[PDB]
Amino acid sequence: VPHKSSLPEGIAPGTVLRIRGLVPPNASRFHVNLLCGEEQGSDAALHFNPRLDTSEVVFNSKEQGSWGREERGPGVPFQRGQPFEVLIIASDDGFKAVVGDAQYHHFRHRLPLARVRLVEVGGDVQLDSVRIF
Amino acid sequence: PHKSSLPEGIAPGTVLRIRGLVPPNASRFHVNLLCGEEQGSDAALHFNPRLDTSEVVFNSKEQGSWGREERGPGVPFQRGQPFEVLIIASDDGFKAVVGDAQYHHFRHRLPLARVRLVEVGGDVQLDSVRIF
């Protein structure tokens, strides 16, 4: 961490981002970002932000340097000291977040999916693997 | 064989996650995406790992007739060993992922929207089928 998977050909409907790792014992929060470029502060088609400290999972986007309106999933299917598996699945309509074996949240596209060019995973997380199919 | 009806209408972004164990004496097993619950319904995707000949056969079926086979490289399964398969529907075909790698891309031969059922059979101990 901070992880960085470049996506020069972008991502299309039917793309699966598979993220496996450990939330370490003193973790505050971590994030998975689908970014439109490599510059610092690049627009984000999806910002996925489990907050162990506040017991929420936040979803948002960023454009022109300005954040959108946050969406929240139900509860927090993550725990300090426990490993996790997250799927982020691109459809034509948005991103499906799967945590464990349960569909967790659907985030409607706000930026065109064709803008995505990079996946960034950072924060308080010890990554096992990041794979993009 | 195991059968699971599709829950929300297949589309680009539908992911089938299949977990299971290949028995020590396995010859082959298959995952079929079928267009109906009739026996004899078209198969938009037939995914057929062959432990015997160490290949993976891909095919479709239409009106009782099998299509052109796509026999891919090696078998990413082992007798006595567990597995996790993802079948991912995209606009252009089905991504078949096993373990940590996309094994093959099977271009759509039938309209994706005709798929209504997943079937899992052959020499396989099926742990779970999930549709996401």
Side-chain angles (χ1 to χ4, degrees), chain A residues 5-95:
Chain A
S5 307
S6 268
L7 299 166
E9 300 207 328
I11 61 171
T15 291
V16 179
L17 168 54
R18 191 185 73 194
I19 299 150
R20 300 166 161 174
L22 169 69
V23 174
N26 298 117
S28 290
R29 45 189 63 187
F30 71 98
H31 53 265
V32 178
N33 294 152
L34 286 61
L35 302 178
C36 297
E38 286 164 41
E39 70 278 13
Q40 185 64 60
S42 155
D43 289 359
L46 172 67
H47 165 71
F48 171 79
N49 186 205
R51 301 176 180 179
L52 289 305
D53 46 7
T54 63
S55 297
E56 314 192 282
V57 180
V58 165
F59 296 72
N60 205 356
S61 56
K62 180 188 221 204
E63 307 179 58
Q64 295 85 0
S66 288
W67 290 98
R69 183 172 184 89
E70 289 174 346
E71 309 176 12
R72 287 160 156 74
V76 51
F78 300 91
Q79 186 173 355
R80 293 168 170 140
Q82 293 300 141
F84 64 85
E85 177 168 34
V86 170
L87 306 194
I88 304 292
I89 310 174
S91 73
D92 275 278
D93 289 345
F95 301 107

Side-chain angles (χ1 to χ4, degrees), chain A residues 83-130:
Chain A
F84 64 85
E85 177 168 34
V86 170
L87 306 194
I88 304 292
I89 310 174
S91 73
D92 275 278
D93 289 345
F95 301 107
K96 293 177 283 185
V98 181
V99 184
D101 280 63
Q103 161 69 17
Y104 177 68
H105 185 76
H106 179 257
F107 185 90
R108 182 170 294 107
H109 290 314
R110 311 162 168 188
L111 295 66
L113 180 60
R115 285 197 66 207
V116 170
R117 243 190 166 272
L118 165 83
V119 175
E120 183 178 2
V121 184
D124 303 328
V125 61
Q126 298 192 282
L127 278 173
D128 187 337
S129 57
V130 177

Side-chain angles (χ1 to χ4, degrees), chain B residues 73-84:
Chain B
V75 55
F77 303 87
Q78 306 87 46
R79 287 170 173 147
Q81 291 300 312
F83 63 83
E84 172 169 312

Side-chain angles (χ1 to χ4, degrees), chain B residues 22-71:
Chain B
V22 177
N25 73 340
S27 157
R28 62 199 78 179
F29 72 95
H30 67 267
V31 179
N32 288 337
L33 296 185
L34 303 184
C35 297
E37 283 230 30
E38 309 267 57
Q39 338 298 330
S41 298
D42 300 345
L45 163 67
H46 171 65
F47 169 76
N48 193 189
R50 308 268 182 92
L51 287 311
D52 39 41
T53 55
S54 308
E55 333 161 70
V56 186
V57 173
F58 291 80
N59 214 345
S60 57
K61 164 135 70 162
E62 284 171 51
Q63 295 295 100
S65 300
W66 289 102
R68 144 192 91 99
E69 273 187 356
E70 288 172 38
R71 284 164 102 89

